[PDB]
Design an enzyme around this catalytic site. Structure first.
Site, PDB file in Angstrom:
ATOM      1  N   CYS A 242      85.563  49.297   4.846  1.00 36.79           N
ATOM      2  CA  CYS A 242      85.023  50.644   4.286  1.00 36.79           C
ATOM      3  C   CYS A 242      84.875  51.660   5.510  1.00 36.79           C
ATOM      4  O   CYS A 242      85.292  52.728   5.351  1.00 36.79           O
ATOM      5  CB  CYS A 242      83.764  50.656   3.704  1.00 36.79           C
ATOM      6  SG  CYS A 242      84.106  49.956   1.808  1.00 36.79           S
TER       7      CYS A 242
ATOM      8  N   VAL B 116      99.279  51.320  -9.505  1.00 36.77           N
ATOM      9  CA  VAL B 116      98.342  52.056  -8.755  1.00 36.77           C
ATOM     10  C   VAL B 116      97.491  50.565  -7.899  1.00 36.77           C
ATOM     11  O   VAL B 116      97.301  49.773  -8.236  1.00 36.77           O
ATOM     12  CB  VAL B 116      97.286  52.573  -9.654  1.00 36.77           C
ATOM     13  CG1 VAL B 116      96.106  53.155  -8.904  1.00 36.77           C
ATOM     14  CG2 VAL B 116      97.891  53.415 -10.338  1.00 36.77           C
TER      15      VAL B 116
ATOM     16  N   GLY C 157      98.779  45.116 -11.884  1.00 34.09           N
ATOM     17  CA  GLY C 157      97.484  44.623 -11.314  1.00 34.09           C
ATOM     18  C   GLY C 157      96.251  45.627 -11.945  1.00 34.09           C
ATOM     19  O   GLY C 157      95.922  46.252 -11.250  1.00 34.09           O
TER      20      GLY C 157
ATOM     21  N   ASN D 214      95.863  38.385 -11.740  1.00 36.57           N
ATOM     22  CA  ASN D 214      96.247  36.956 -11.305  1.00 36.57           C
ATOM     23  C   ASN D 214      94.561  36.416 -11.021  1.00 36.57           C
ATOM     24  O   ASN D 214      94.405  35.774 -10.280  1.00 36.57           O
ATOM     25  CB  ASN D 214      96.837  36.814 -10.138  1.00 36.57           C
ATOM     26  CG  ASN D 214      96.382  37.673  -8.974  1.00 36.57           C
ATOM     27  OD1 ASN D 214      95.620  38.524  -9.208  1.00 36.57           O
ATOM     28  ND2 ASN D 214      97.247  37.422  -7.721  1.00 36.57           N
TER      29      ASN D 214
ATOM     30  N   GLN E 259      88.331  38.975 -13.245  1.00 35.85           N
ATOM     31  CA  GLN E 259      88.504  40.002 -13.796  1.00 35.85           C
ATOM     32  C   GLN E 259      88.965  40.215 -15.129  1.00 35.85           C
ATOM     33  O   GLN E 259      88.860  41.519 -15.840  1.00 35.85           O
ATOM     34  CB  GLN E 259      89.610  40.750 -12.851  1.00 35.85           C
ATOM     35  CG  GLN E 259      89.730  40.303 -11.204  1.00 35.85           C
ATOM     36  CD  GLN E 259      90.950  40.928 -10.429  1.00 35.85           C
ATOM     37  OE1 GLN E 259      91.059  42.301 -10.419  1.00 35.85           O
ATOM     38  NE2 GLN E 259      91.575  39.866 -10.124  1.00 35.85           N
TER      39      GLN E 259
ATOM     40  N   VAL F  13     101.746  39.188 -10.950  1.00 32.18           N
ATOM     41  CA  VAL F  13     103.083  40.377 -11.286  1.00 32.18           C
ATOM     42  C   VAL F  13     104.153  39.833 -10.636  1.00 32.18           C
ATOM     43  O   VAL F  13     105.157  39.904 -11.159  1.00 32.18           O
ATOM     44  CB  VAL F  13     102.636  41.700 -10.741  1.00 32.18           C
ATOM     45  CG1 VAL F  13     103.815  42.830 -10.856  1.00 32.18           C
ATOM     46  CG2 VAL F  13     101.443  42.082 -11.676  1.00 32.18           C
TER      47      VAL F  13
END
Lengths: 317, 319
Positions: free
Chosen positions: B294, B164, B98, B122, B126, B149
């Site tokens: 957040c 992580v 990831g 995936n 990105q 993954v």
């Protein structure tokens, strides 16, 4: 030179009540020593301690006494061991450091199809057990007189008990690696250890008014923490993990103290024969009285939520 | 139900949302803490055993925007701490599971020119937010594999593996670590970091009829909040080498900083999202979600001076 307080306790000039008061102070000092303001620090302390154990060595009584001593709280606990160790009739069983054979005898009688092998340090204990076997007519039990840290065999066992044995060990990694070799295919290892809930430590004096430590533990032994064996899973893996509060060992020590005191005149007799002296008898007796008094107090701390019992079930690999 | 709609149109202030979360938090703590260590431990082991029965498991301009300390610096400090605790050395083969924004993959690859770094994502997007960075920085030691993954299969082994912000998305840690252990090279190490609660673990299920946070933020996926020590009970295929925690003040700070950059740039972000989603209010709804995320999680991790929710790091070797 704190060494004077002792014979004062020892001629009885110091009351049980005073000894509890003294231990209360010792407990507060140990707790303050061990607790840390943050979880980051508390965990670092534990992992650092576990790593230090890997740098250590694995490890460092008259029969009329065993007859007097040696109560269905003992039975409750031993049934609890059999249930959590998933004992089934027919299995081969290894009892490491079987001691008074309390567990060995209990399993042998409950599970008559099991073969129960005990390993002990001592002549007197092997004697007490194998002559407990004769009165229950147990053909179920074999006791091997040997050092557990030196023992090894081609034989593997379906179930291995290790109760009150970790307390004498230091390098848990070497201990569990050796024991792992004795576990049969799909076998299980059951360990019980006295601990503090959160931190571990070696028995070293906390300051120069600390008598408990050198009196009770004269060189280097370790108090485990409840989670410390989770960091020793190179050769075995954890199946389950339980704790029991300190009230259980607390009560145990108080009951043992009571049985001693209720029979003190005949205990005082037995140890004079065995030791050849009244002074030495007196000091065995005083040591074990203070041990029970001090540890009863320790384990009761904060309603039993400081020091307590930890049980861990392991499988191989 | 209608509480959600209202937040999206900005009639529910940030302070109200913090307050709502303080309440949620106190409920979750009361639900999790037990009167005795016996019960507390039983709760954790029973939860870990239940995990063993479960399954294992963005427009580029936004990524370009979002990517006392500044956000930048704390990120760099954290990635240096990972490289130190994971014992990274020039020359190693390195797998990043990831790899996401690709921040860590790029950080490692840039610092150790002799390392070969392989990342797994995936994503449509990105992957070339990373692969664009590479051509820019002129790095040739990065490879990115487009893959889940969960289903990823390889026969390659690696000296170092990073996981992580990955565990947060997994349930069956047992299955995860078994598959990953087969990718660890001889004498290699796996470094895992996960958000957690210090003592207890739980699935995100609503605590009561007034629990809007759980359904709003974790609609489904029956997601799991780990405890700091839960991975100790998953050592069948890997063995713990070290274990650290960091207080909640660190992620709390991060969530605040992220929201500040989002808010400092909302004009561009709304532009980007409402173009990208072909609907203005559908874009207000993705923006609201991440703002609330957040604000709520900044508050959650701050709780009791960072000593409730926090970060756990675990270094593993192969069994």
């Amino acid at each position: 030179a704190v060494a004077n307080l002792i014979k004062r306790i020892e001629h009885g000039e110091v009351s049980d009540e005073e000894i509890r008061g003294m231990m209360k102070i010792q407990v507060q000092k140990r707790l303050k020593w061990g607790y840390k303001p943050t979880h980051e620090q508390q965990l670092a302390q534990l992992v650092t301690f576990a790593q230090s154990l890997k740098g250590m060595e694995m490890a460092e009584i008259p029969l009329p006494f065993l007859h007097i001593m040696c109560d269905e709280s003992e039975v409750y606990m031993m049934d609890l061991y059999c249930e959590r160790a998933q004992i089934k009739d027919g299995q081969s069983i290894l009892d490491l450091g079987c001691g008074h054979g309390s567990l060995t005898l209990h399993v042998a009688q409950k599970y008559r199809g099991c073969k129960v092998t005990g390993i002990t340090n001592s002549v007197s204990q092997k004697e007490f057990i194998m002559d407990q076997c004769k009165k229950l007519d147990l053909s179920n039990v074999e006791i091997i007189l040997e050092d557990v840290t030196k023992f090894e065999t081609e034989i593997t066992y379906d179930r291995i008990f290790a109760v009150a044995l970790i307390e004498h060990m230091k390098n848990y990694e070497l201990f569990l690696k050796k024991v792992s070799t004795w576990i049969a295919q799909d076998g299980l290892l059951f360990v019980e250890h006295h601990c503090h809930k959160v931190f571990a430590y070696q028995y070293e004096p906390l300051d120069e008014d600390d008598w408990y430590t050198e009196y009770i533990f004269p060189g280097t032994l370790v108090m485990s923490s409840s989670s410390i064996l989770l960091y020793f899973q190179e050769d075995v893996s954890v199946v389950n993990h339980w704790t029991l509060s300190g009230k259980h060992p607390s009560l145990g020590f108080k009951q043992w103290l009571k049985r001693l005191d209720d029979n003190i005149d005949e205990v005082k007799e037995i140890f004079e024969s065995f030791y050849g002296s009244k002074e030495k008898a007196m000091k065995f007796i005083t040591y074990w009285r203070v041990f029970c008094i001090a540890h009863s107090q320790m384990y009761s701390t904060n309603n039993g939520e400081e020091w307590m019992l930890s049980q861990v079930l392991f499988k191989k690999k």
